[PDB]
């Protein structure tokens, strides 16, 4: 569903529900561009933290995909529905905060060649605020204004609470803009960056990193999405039984919602592959499982 | 008429003659932003050069206009360039740029449509990156910059409102980024623009200091309907689109007209007193080239 501002709110409690029937989600974000400077090295992870936080930290996060996946046992299927929605910090009044963000050429004409729609952007944005702004901005209609200019960051607020697991691929980013935008603004040190992380994605899992990891590093050559999507397909791995839910649509042109989607797969494929280090060896290995708890909460 | 990349390379030549038949043109630019940080001393040019520079001019809209001595009324031709630096290669400089979110917002409700920027924006090159690059490949990557260069070898007189920042955006991003001095982006600007005219400054200068109180665009062409001003006579060029959401050709349309008004009250100056006055009399050459 590609869900703007005249649109987010009556579409509000399908997502709500997508993500309390859920077993885990994928997500993916655009941005407004990747580094304003370096390619971005001698640097502790504390310095690189520092140097993200200062170098990327000021583009936007406009797209946010969100993919919702539930396990229907008599059938032996995932069933998905995922969501696009578009973002902006279009301010309440002339007392909110007036964002500067920077673009950057050479992304903005990536997203463009991927036939993504700027206007959904720039003129549908849905608003959002973070903690302190929401607490700080504070009769049938301005008390609905009110409610309605929190906005997409009411979704992170569901997702945080779920406590599910929150699927990513090379995520680092995709969580500082996360947090950044819609729970609060980046601290100084990493070490509180790691405590935030932590109550807006309690259990976070790269899919990038998992494949970088044994037993997966011994089998698979390129990790990026789209490589390790077409890896997963063949052996020792095997393509999981997907179907989209009832009324939704499906999946190829590069997109947040759709990148949540083959991340999920790809996540999907891994986990049921260590399966096969049971006796005797499962077929299918649910989120919860254990053979996954190694995995969880790493991107150092 | 609205120019895309599409559409650039069939209409330079409309764009050329309208650029060659005028007596003047007006402008005016729509941009990312304007703020930074501050909100709402002669080194002003430092201060908007850190705090506004980084914004984008992605929309220039230009009003062509020529006088009919055998009608007495001026002809106009409007045109709306959207322009983006795509980049020539992953070689040449990407380009980043900094979007104000209340300024977007503002454009949003005035009808703009992003995708004609940040999908189908025309493509330029300042001087720098055109003496550097060294077929046609390449004369299409110079792109929207063609049109300031015909302007520039014009000679004609350029008018716009409060033109700082457009004439700052102008050299900066299809002549070459902007100098430490002062003084020397005077020199550019006079390569850019060698007539200047500013209808804010000129309303803000006697004898329109005592008659002008306001001298935002939209009061200013409101006054200079009413005694002593009289509205000028104009008409759009046969099989052109003609004059409403603030929008840089549009602007640049009231502009001119604002500076027409202005030009002929100073005909009221002279014994007989004349109704019309050039864009190249003698009155106007005491408002040129100030923009401060």
Redesign the interface.
């Known amino acids: 569903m590609e869900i703007i501002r005249s649109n987010f709110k009556s579409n509000l409690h399908k997502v709500y529900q997508a993500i309390e029937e859920a077993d885990f989600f994928a997500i993916d974000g655009e941005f407004?561009?990747i580094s304003?400077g370096p390619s971005v090295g001698f640097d502790t992870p504390e310095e690189r933290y520092q140097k993200l936080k200062k170098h990327s930290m000021d583009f936007?996060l406009f797209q946010f995909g969100l993919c919702t996946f539930k396990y229907d046992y008599t059938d032996s299927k995932y069933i998905t529905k995922s969501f696009n929605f578009y973002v902006?910090?279009?301010?309440f009044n002339r007392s909110s905060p007036?964002?500067?963000?920077?673009?950057?050429?050479?992304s903005?004409?990536f997203?463009?060649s991927q036939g993504?729609?700027?206007?959904k952007?720039?003129?549908n944005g849905i608003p959002y605020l973070n903690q302190e702004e929401e607490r700080q901005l504070r009769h049938a209609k301005e008390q609905e204004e009110l409610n309605d200019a929190v906005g997409f960051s009411r979704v992170i607020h569901a997702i945080a609470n779920s406590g599910k697991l929150v699927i990513g691929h090379n995520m680092l980013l995709d969580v500082m803009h996360t947090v950044h935008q819609f729970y609060c603004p980046l601290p100084a040190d990493l070490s509180e960056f790691k405590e935030m992380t932590t109550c807006v994605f309690p259990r976070l899992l790269d899919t990038k990193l998992m494949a970088s990891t044994q037993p997966f590093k011994d089998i698979i050559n390129n990790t990026s999405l789209a490589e390790l999507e077409k890896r997963l397909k063949e052996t020792p791995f095997n393509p999981p039984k997907v179907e989209s839910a009832e009324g939704f649509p499906s999946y190829q042109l590069h997109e947040a919602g759709y990148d949540a989607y083959i991340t999920g797969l790809c996540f999907i494929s891994m986990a049921n592959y260590l399966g096969s280090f049971l006796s005797p060896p499962k077929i299918h290995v649910s989120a919860r499982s254990k053979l996954i708890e190694p995995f969880f909460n790493k991107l150092f």
């Open positions: 407004s561009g304003d936007l902006f910090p279009k301010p007036d964002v500067k963000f920077v673009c950057q050429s050479s903005i004409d997203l463009a993504f729609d700027f206007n952007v720039f003129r």
